[PDB]
């Protein structure tokens, strides 16, 4: 019953909210899935602020 | 994932749920239990 | 005419047609393919020789050194078969190879052999195929089923109309190599020719053409014709070819010679075209406005600027016509495209095709094949010339190339096993043809488009894989090569090769435990054409198209036998006479009929050769001459039958069985059953369990003598002769003087195989059927096997049935067996189990095999000798200790009240834990064999030494008899040279045979051969000494065992299961049915003489299932057992053998133009009485399958005995004693005993052992595990109101890990309460969801 | 372990067959029980989702029973022995019953 | 203990697959911490963060993003979403349809003497299924001092356990079942008759409901433990209460 | 016509005689009683046993143009049997997959 | 040429 955690060194996108057919991280940001993965694979930067 | 983002809440009130969660089906002999429980709440 | 061992019981045969082709050896698939594989091929064909010639010679990366094959060998097995099964090992043969490494000269590319080097090297082992086609992998005899996959080559398929809603049937040509990347063209509904490679994304199909450096001009050249246009003094007159106008409308007034042939808008009739041909109308003036719809072939460039006036593949716009006429071109050629017989598809594909130049095609293929990687020229070109053209990574091996050429209608049938420009371009031209309309697609379900991989070919493929896996390392290691520091053994592993071939043999979808609980099952499992396995479709992919019995299965695969259930028609089974073609395609024998005669030259035809000729029917009346007798005969030309002329048939069928498998030609009266019940019957008959007295099929089909001999179980003599010693465990044949070799002692010794467990736990046995001092002949049986009777396959036993409803104890399909069938012990089988008591090593200490177990009374250990193992012979029940094993325990605990109890009663808690082996619950048996495997370096206990002493006496005895037999032949040759001039009749053989040696004779080799005898004799002495010493070593050496296991013991039990309610039984015709009551003998219906009836089947099973076979076969079995009663009555009065001879001769001559002809006039009175005493029980009748006994002959036979014609007897009712109105059938249906025994079925679980992760019960009856109460039963309780039943059903009985112990406590306290709680598996569900990123908790209120 | 495997590969290419765990003692420098332990060091754990035939597509994990459980007959009998010792120790004197419930 | 590394007998361990997926995630995690401790070049820490994203990904759900990281044998690992999903997840396999104690099956057969409120049920299955009841009954009538004594008494199958079985059987329904349980009448509770043999004799008017041939069709006899479930098997589910099809 | 003939000969062909010449009632053909009670089988299966059986169709569904003219009391020869096998296996492969 | 691939090795 006792669970444990792992302190991820870098953040990491929960796959279900990124690849479920209507992509939740996608439509939340109003951003197509392809560009989000281009950011996640460390292909292309993304602007913030 | 949809219920997760939407924060959805399951109040059991079915037969499939009360079979999942291991308790009396609210159908036949269990119907009395569940009605009596609904009155035992909010009396 | 008959064998002396055939005159023991010669079977009547109602076969009206003559046999022309003996049923071939039913196990030639397995044996002949593997003998292809592991055998010297002095040529580059099949074998290991093929694999080594393919991969070798391995040569380094231009490193002036290469490694090259020389020759190979297969050493003999370390262990022959029986030792191999007893010991667990695989039965293999070390594969010695003679590699040879050579280094070249120094800095000379033509370098001479600098340093050659030769040494044979072990690379792997390979399991040898037994005498029968069964390998022995880990002491479990296995079979590699055949395989029926798609032939390599090109297959033009339709996918008709279902792909797209328009209904426009697409087309696609697929190229399937035997090894490598697929290659797949096709059309999309716009009719653009698309190419697919390994089934990736499509592409414009001219992309590969451009990758084959074909510029657009010669692509248009290849796929189209030419319409020429001359600028002849005004606006492009046309050079016309006549037939080009075909199927069109002349939309302009096409004249010629001042003769307007065609009016405008007028479709050119065939009259017009023949008229144009007659008039030779070539060059005709045309309005130029018609050449606005053409397409230029080449590219047109002016002379003045040299610029590109119009590119290749450009549809002519009249401005382009002006721009070209201004430059002065004579020829303006275009493409010839019609809607009908010449389509514009390569042109349109070129339109959509984005690429232009070969670099673009290569890079585009690369990007589709390797997305993401930046394409490079050398990388792209290597990828392309490695997809389809490297001899390494692609092959259409000669079957592929043959089918490829025959499909493209080439003329040669041999070629290079890689594609070429011609092959792909012809595939596209054939796909474009088959689009335009000429040609026909192929269907996968056509047994000429469906090959067979046997065992040899698949094992060879795995060995080839092993060789490439070693060639990679060989090249890696000759890269950094030295010259003399490495022999050819430091380079080459084996574990790659060995791992590959061994992991195929021991673990494949096609490598299964033999279904050996019958002879028929073994021999119908070796012969199995499975469509599953590697490189072939699956249960889910297919697909009812391949499941269905296609009309080219006639004589190649059985229609009616197929393992029904999830894979029906995926596991088709090869027919009686079908063989394998040279290339793998199935083929079957057919009699060549000449002009009118039916020549008996049988003549094998494959699946696509058959579709051309017109073949007769097997049951065609032809009489006395070889001519047909009718004026028109039924045949079949192309998947269809019809009446054909007498001088138009070409082939006749060999025999009337050649369409069925061997499983389904043992069924009498198959022609009378529905195909469905024959499927189920042919499919149950190989589950019949070998009973205790093999009987015989009282109504058979003659396929059973061969199913028993051509199997392995019966022990057939090799060389004829006369029997000399017949123990119940060996036969010893005094071979004849003629068949005996020139010099060797000819006596054959046959070590019968006594009670030994099979795979299905049954008991495979062998009894002698011979008698002491009786002649034998070659190819003759000596020993019945399990379920054989004098050489006929006896699967079950036949017993007097009766078709009447008997008070519902045979209600649905149930059977009402009388007590005399259980009382005569006639279905009592013998089952043999193998218990094991492994004795492992634990960190606390070794587990011992002591007989000093803690906590058991002396009466439990009375079956255990001092060493712990039970005595051979001692009938155990369920729960006895078979091997006392006790494991070291440490420091458990003591709860309070237990320290109290122990202190009160002065007991010292035990140091060691009971872990014995005990007989499983319910089972009885008599332990027929114990075996102890002691790891090397552990001190053998008492019983291991007793067993070694026993085995050693036995080995020494057997080998001593061997040495006697061999010394016999040595002195035989001796006397042969001395007797052949220099013989003494009595002056030499009185004194002993040892003074035989020391004698001489005058100057000759007889003067000589003094050293011949002495050398041979002392040679045999020394050689047999080392033989016996090697046997004493293999007995005495410490066995090899898994790591951390001290000693294994294998208590072998032999249970004798009788027959009882529940044990399923089933006749041959698909009438199955569970015994439902065992009546006393009195209660059975009894006929007028008082003979009770042994089984009471149900009347109401026949009209609905429609297996009328069981009724005709009841009737003819009754006739046969009637002749049995008549002959028994002639042998009780024992009047004369004249009357016997005449009577049996009457009963054999009966029939209507039968072929069985026996004359008992030539049978000696010593033989006719033996024949009769074999026929006392009832004259065995045959009935070849589609050729059987007709009904009129059955009645005639029933009149031969004094039985009644109807077959229906007045039965009385043994209870009330009053006749059953309306007479009932009685006959002897031959009834099998399927091994769905009920005492392998009953099971029950009060509380047992529970699963690990989700604390619920375990699987079924091996883990002692509760039933499954799945969703459908939950709905069936929700449909009632059982919400209490359901709650305890999925909470307390199953999962609630606290409530279930607290339920057991209540149930013993006389209190039936419960406490519901939360099932543990739901709570596992919460921790697993909650161990995602999700949070799922229980709102508490 | 890599030393054992490499010398075993050599011994197998050389001795023809597969060498026995005592001969590795002679080709290496081992007491021949150290090599028995080194071979006994277990290989990779069989993934508990190995497919096993069979009988509705069941994996190995369905077959590994639970060992830390205690079967309910011993739980019942512990309860029964608790009750028996209570009713027994009631038979003694109160002070002796307490000294024995405490000892 | 929901992803165990239990040692199956033989010195071989039998781990789960989540041990593999977590082991990989934590290895790539620790390595990324190092690659940030050495102040590494950018491309290496980017590669490591991609590998870690893949590892956490193949853990939470494998085969979803790109191709499945294959297990040790040769096979996709069963990551968590494959624990839950499918015909064999927790939801349909271990949670809706549980395996069950007090249950068994053997071949069915005819037995027409029966009244159609009873099913001939073998002595041996009945003594196996009804052992809690027998133990309680024996120590109640005092024929066996302790529970262990009662256990060995019914294992030796003396002449009193068969009397005690005939008495704790008497008015006690059991729930026969046939494998494809299409409609709600393919579970009907009968009253056992103790019958020699090893085949569950099933009444002949009942085959139309269960849809049973008697050529090998096995049936499962579950048991109503408690008192309310005996009452529901008698009133609701009995065989003389649904002689009309609910459709 | 063959089916109707077998049934007209199968159902009433018992001709009897009570204190007189001859009458005919429903028959006692054992297979006919089993088909007329409703116990097993319909007139279809009786048809296949007595009368000629069916017009077996190829796996296309394109019905063949020469029926299996022989019934299960006579013998289906090799051709007629091999044509029965098509539909036999189609029925089995359905009822597995329904 | 950025996307069109879900392999980390290629990236
Ligand atoms: C004479 C003959 C040599 C030919 C010259 C040798 C070769 C092998 C010998 C037999 C075998 O042992 C089998 C058999 C075993 C019985 O238990 C005892 C008798 C038998 C008949 C033996 C007697 C005889 O000595 C045989 C025939
Ligand atoms: C049913 C199955 C045969 C199917 C064909 C056979 C083949 C392999 C057998 C298991 C293995 O021994 C591993 C394991 C060892 C434990 O210690 C005891 C349980 C386990 C699960 C065994 C039980 C069962 O007997 C198995 C599943
Ligand atoms: C993959 C294979 C499927 C069956 C075909 C599975 C099913 C159960 C597995 C065996 C069991 O663990 C028992 C045994 C334990 C030993 O100690 C180590 C090896 C053994 C032989 C295992 C190898 C193999 O993995 C088996 C046969
Ligand atoms: Mg059935």
Residue numbers in the entry:
A (entry chain J): 100 to 148
B (entry chain J): 1333 to 1375
C (entry chain I): 2 to 1342
D (entry chain L): 460 to 562
E (entry chain J): 248 to 494
F (entry chain J): 692 to 789
G (entry chain L): 90 to 100
Extract from the study:
Analysis of the rpsT P2-RPo cryo-EM data gave rise to two conformational classes that differed only in the disposition of the upstream promoter DNA and αCTDs. We focus here on the highest resolution class at a nominal resolution of 3.4 Å. The closed-clamp RNAP in the rpsT P2-RPo cryo-EM structure interacts with the promoter DNA in the same way as in RPo structures determined by X-ray crystallography or cryo-EM and is consistent with the DNase I footprint of the rpsT P2 RPo. In the rpsT P2-RPo structure we observed an α-subunit C-terminal domain [αCTD; Ross et al., 1993] bound to the promoter DNA minor groove just upstream of the promoter −35 element [−38 to −43, corresponding to the proximal UP element subsite; Estrem et al., 1999]. This αCTD interacts with σ704 through an interface previously characterized through genetic analyses. The αCTDs are linked to the α-N-terminal domains (αNTDs) by ~15 residue flexible linkers. Density for the residues connecting the αCTD and αNTD was not observed in the cryo-EM map. As expected, the clamp positions for RPo, with nucleic acids stably bound in the downstream duplex channel, were restricted even further for all three of the major clamp motions.
